[model samples]
Target: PVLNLNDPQAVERYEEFMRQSPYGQVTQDLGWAKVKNNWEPVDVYLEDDQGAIIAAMSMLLGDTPTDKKFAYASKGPVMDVTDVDLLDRLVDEAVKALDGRAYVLRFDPEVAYSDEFNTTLQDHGYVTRNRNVADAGMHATIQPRLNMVLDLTKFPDAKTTLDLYPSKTKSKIKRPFRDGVEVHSGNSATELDEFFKTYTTMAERHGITHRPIEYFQRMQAAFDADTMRIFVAEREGKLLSTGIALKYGRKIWYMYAGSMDGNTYYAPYAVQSEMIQWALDTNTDLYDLGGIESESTDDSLYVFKHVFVKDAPREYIGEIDKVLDPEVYAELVKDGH
Candidate 1:
């Protein structure tokens, strides 16, 4: 049966379930729902006959431009991917819980690629979406299909973690120290405001749309300082780099980062090291370095993230859609509809 998060107890159970799953993702964390301001959040959990929850998924329902509601489960349905029966049950319960309010329920579970996984979803009437990130239109998926995640199980301290990185990276991280580049957690309002400016500067330099300062404010307000963090690097009095990350369960997600362009002080590395240090200190199971946007292994961003993960990225089965109303969905997908 489906357990709605409307009950405070359900919320506790849902978060606990997320933490227990080995494949847990911050996107699937109930805390993230507060960030999706425009979407209505719902959590679904399957319980045994004894009423103990065995599976859980957190989803968002939002009205589309065409006025139809659609549910999105970003990197979710934390459960055993090989269990088709369990997956089927969650799908059916999710549909009923939504009460036909949504035309489709979109999912991009954080499970490794497997023919059996795809076949099971297909047998249950789910359709896979674009496999390549290039083909996925912006906002089509909340999480990229590929990402770099550092295994922290063997790392007990910052020095051990730093030893794993190349000498060049270590020198870069240390270079800023002598030059007065101080990296520290940003906690005050003024510090966060500075981070917003730095973040916007980096976004404009890269030509990417970024969140507003208010968005970050909402994030900090929704989650505790321990669970959500902002890091800033400064040279003397000037801000040089910034990063925002979230920690929950066993992983620390390096979510957003920005830096001044063409700076020789290596403040970006300093800022990243701060987050990596936190991951080591906390003994988090994984440090997700986020996306590597290109297949060209040599891409600068790819190279930067690859160094920490040793060039291996975790690739998941891409977006899968469970259509609740096939007729309308097919019409929506038509080229000239």
Candidate 2:
């Protein structure tokens, strides 16, 4: 059954469960609800007959006036993807809960790609939202279908982990320090002001839409200092680069970063290295550098991340949507609305 868990105490219990074996995502964290102010975050759990939660997800439903509403769960619907029966039951309940109110229930589960799992979902009537549109303007996949992760499982210590990077990349980390760039971290609101300035400017340069400062302020307020950080790289007291990193379960992610471009000082790599070091210090299983465009695209961003994470990208099953109102969804997609 869908027992909506929104209260702090209830949400905390769910969050603790996520940090356990299966490993939940920061996006799935209830706190993310506040950051994504535009949506209404509903934390719901599906439990077994014994009343133990077997599956959980934080679904962010779009605040649309029409019957054709969109709901997304990024890195979500946490459960045993291989268990066909449980997954089907879970989706069945979700569909019933969102019927009419939501035209579609879309998600890209955190679980890795598996042929059996894909087959199960398809057989259960959950089909991928065909490449589509806006007003709820967003990609078919809310999160990137592919991502680069640095496997920290083998490295025993920080030094060993640092050695994985090629000398040139390794040298960039040192260059920042030699060039008098200091990496400073803070959780205070004042520090966030500086970080946001750098972040928003970079977003503008690259034609990326960035969240407002209040969004991060809410995020920093929601997660404890240990769970989230705002780090800035400065040269002679002027901010040159800034970033935000998040820790959830066994994964530490470089969530967002921005920098003053066209400078000789390589502060960006240093910022990433610092975040990677934090992951190593905590013995995180993976340091996710976030997503890349499709391999076919001429993406310099993909090439830049490769300098640090040499491993091939990890591919998720991507997004699959279970349409609740077929006709409405069909019309919306057809019109690209």
Candidate 3:
């Protein structure tokens, strides 16, 4: 059944369910809908015979440039993906609920990629995209199929967060501190403005479009201080780097970040160190360094993130689409692609 966000009790129940579920992610949280205010929200859930919630998904409905409506559930459908019957039934409900309202229902579950799983999804009448990072490119998928994560529990001998890193990364992490770089957390509007400055500068330097400051402002308001924070790296009163960290379920995600030009202090490394410390302090299970282009080692972004952890990037089952309106889908592809 589709959840009524307007009901306080229902909202509370849903929030608890999301928090307790292992498959839950910040992107699937109700607050994320507020962060992406431009997209309309459609939250759905499935229950067992006793009325206990077994599966839930929060989707955002938005329009493409061609005015064709589509629904996206990012890292969603918080349930056992291995349960074929349950997965099929829940997707069927979602499709029926959005009938005629959306042309495509897109979702990217957190399950690992496998040919067996791909066949399973295909059998269920879904079209899968980008089985690996090579096919995804930079823009092919809404979220990167490959991600770098640090399993905090794996390092039992480590006494500090710095111990989690290798010798070279340990030195790089310490350089900022020795150079007098300080890291602090903030959630205030003015602090977010400061973060936007570096963020915009970084985006411009890379020749990529950046989100407006209002988007970050809305995000700051949507989540609590404990769940989200903006960490800024500064040296002698000058901001050098900024990063946004989010804690949901058992993971602390380094969600977004940026750095100023000509900063020699390695302040971005400091920002990551601080966030990793937070993860350790909170006893979080994983420190998600976020997405990367797998096999593209030459990419600066990939190189920077890979330095901190030696593990191979996790490859997730990429975006899966259920096309409801073939005519509208064809038109969108023709006009947009």
Candidate 4:
């Protein structure tokens, strides 16, 4: 079935289709209309005669003023990696759609670290851009490096997995208990909003830019109470911060979070310790503590994560920027305002 991004049901179905697909991510939904970013959702899907969707892709289209040259195709098209011809067709169709309108059509598939895949992309006039975003180091390396996962096959048993944590982690939770940072979950949307307000305030204090409230509310709208749980930390009667977890498939993902004013003063370190403890109660397998921006973010954060989970992999993002002309595209990159 052809997807209509305009159709709410279609969009929901497609996202679920992709999420359920093997190669999917939390950011896949963020690619198109994640917030008000939805100019168009020119995505494609391949289905069997039974109408079972075997593959999909969420494409992007953009043009430059000088070239009127834009881009097309899915950043990570969902297809069987073994289907070489399908991959080639998707790229060709993608380029055809963007013909003359875009100077560059880029696609960064979910396939990673495969020499065979690299050979296919390079043969198709696509070059790699290991560092594209402002600070190459600022983004988490999406390679096969640092990732933590809890096997859902053994999930739904808290006591069994608590033993999986290092003895030190149990101690961290116990110490925070004696120190007095209370953890609360199943919070209302109002509390989440309050947390975001406080989050913006804290970010401003730290000179860190943040997305608009509307951007976050979009997420709240997308998953509401059904798929998300908001956990808050309080010291005595004062609220310290909140962590938003996207709980799914035996995995409780710690998504976004907000720290109240002067979190350091209220022993938020203890508070953070308590929040994860609550997640342990849910009987989920993994506690994804996200990745640091290169090795420069709080070294302590990396340390804390390792102290609790122990094993983390450094993942690399496959970079493919295929433009009509490398020289022309190079100039456009410099022209970004």
Return the top candidate by lDDT.
3
Poorest lDDT segment (10 consecutive residues) of candidate 4: 138-147
lDDT (CA) per prediction: 0.76, 0.75, 0.84, 0.57
Best by TM-score: 3
Candidate with better lDDT, 1 vs 3: 3
- Residue-wise C-alpha lDDT for candidate 4, range 122-231, written one tens digit per residue: 67666655433424443322331233343433444445334555676666555644667777766467767766866787788778778887776777766657456676
Candidate 1 lDDT over 83-147, as tens digits, reads: 87888888787887888888888888766666777677778788865353445433345667677
- How much lDDT does candidate 3 score? 0.84
TM-score of each: 0.89, 0.89, 0.94, 0.74
lDDT of 3 by residue, 72-125 (tens): 999888887768779878888888778678888888887788899888988988
Stretches of candidate 4 above 4 Å error?
7-13, 30-39, 60-75, 79-85, 93-117, 131-136, 139-161, 186-188, 247-252, 261-286, 295-301, 324-328, 333-337
Poorly placed runs, candidate 2 (over 4 Å): 4-8, 48-50, 114-116, 129-140, 157-161, 334-337
- Which residue pairs in candidate 2 have backbone atoms (N, alpha carbon, C) closer than 3 angstroms, thus clashing? 134-137
Model 1's alpha-carbon lDDT is 0.76
lDDT by residue for model 2 (1-337), tens = 5555546766766777666745578887878888888887656677678866778777888955565668887777777656767766777777666756788787786667767767777787877532322222224456776678888886655564456677776676677788888887878897788788888889888998988888888898988889998888888887888889998877889888888767828788778878888888787888998887644336666787886787787877777777787876775544333
Q: What's each prediction's clash count?
A: 0, 1, 0, 19
Ranking by lDDT: 3, 1, 2, 4
